[PDB]
Amino acid sequence: TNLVTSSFNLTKPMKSFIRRNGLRVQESVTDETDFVILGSPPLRRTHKFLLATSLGIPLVSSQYLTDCIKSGKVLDFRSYKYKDEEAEAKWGFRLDDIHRRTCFNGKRLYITKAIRDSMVGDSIHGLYSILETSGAEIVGDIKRAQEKDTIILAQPDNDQEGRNMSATGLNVYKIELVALSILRDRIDFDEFLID
Ligand SMILES: [Mg+2]
Ligand code: NA
Ligand code: NA
């Protein structure tokens, strides 16, 4: 059984339980991950959480491993699904909505130069990873971003490409579109439209 943790301090006794009971901690979420343990509420919208949600991987409470130790047994993690009604209301999604996301399947996305340059390193890496994991095609040539139904992600300010594309009549969207659409498995374009 393969698990990942996010926003959680695995203890030494928990690592020993994992080692002795046929569990394995992975560094990254993949299709081979069976569940992700998250730190206790308030839920943090980490990269691992977003990838797990996109891939249909269950999220599990921090209490699971403690109860496994107390019981001396590998309990059913499905009985320890993560709960946070506050986050569900904030972001408009449901944690028990566990399935592979389809909302970016077949979609083409253009990310402006301003975003690419500002996010160089871990941030842009994460954005490309969530998109590609979710079946999106990333467009590199701004001239191809004119093609029908391309989703253009831009900054609301200080973004020459976003400004110029909007000036042609195209719509450009805030980067927050991606994380929230994964959580909802639905793209609510008007919420993210840049004026
Ligand atoms: Mg870590
Ligand atoms: Na962390
Ligand atoms: Na415009």
The CATH number covering residue 21 comes to 3.40.50.10190
Tell whether 76 and 144 lie within a shared domain.
no
Smallest CA-to-CA distance from 8 within 50, 36, 32, 34 is with 36
Strand order in the sheet with 24-25: 24-25, 2-6, 35-38, 59-60
Q: Which ligand is nearest to the CA of 10?
A: 1
- Technique used by the depositors: X-ray
| Cα distance between residue 49 and residue 66, in whole Å | 21
Counting every residue written for the chain, the total comes to: 195
Tell whether 71 and 150 lie within a shared domain.
no
Q: Is residue 101 part of a domain?
A: no
Residues spanned by the domain of 150: 108-192
Q: Which ligand is nearest to the CA of 47?
A: 2
Residue carrying structure tokens 């002795």: 20
> Which parts of the chain are beta strand (E)?
2-6, 24-25, 35-38, 59-60, 108-111, 137-139, 151-153
How far, in Å, from the CA of 6 to the mean position of ligand 1? 6
How far, in Å, from the CA of 135 to the mean position of ligand 3? 28
Q: Which ligand is nearest to the CA of 7?
A: 2
Sort strands 108-111 and 137-139 into parallel, antiparallel or unpaired.
Answer: parallel
How far, in Å, from the CA of 163 to the mean position of ligand 2? 35
How far, in Å, from the CA of 18 to the mean position of ligand 1? 16
Tell whether 112 and 186 lie within a shared domain.
yes
How far, in Å, from the CA of 8 to the mean position of ligand 1? 8
Token digits for 6?
Answer: 């996010």
Crossing angle of helices 176-184 and 122-133, in 10° steps, is 40
Domain count within the chain? 2
Q: Which ligand is nearest to the CA of 163?
A: 3
Q: Which ligand is nearest to the CA of 194?
A: 3
Q: Is residue 96 part of a domain?
A: no
- Other beta carbons within 10 angstroms of residue 174's beta carbon come to 16
Residue carrying structure tokens 């990838």: 51
Q: Is residue 133 part of a domain?
A: yes
Those residues whose beta carbon sits under 5 angstroms from the ion ligand 3 are: 166
Tell whether 39 and 80 lie within a shared domain.
yes
How far, in Å, from the CA of 26 to the mean position of ligand 2? 14
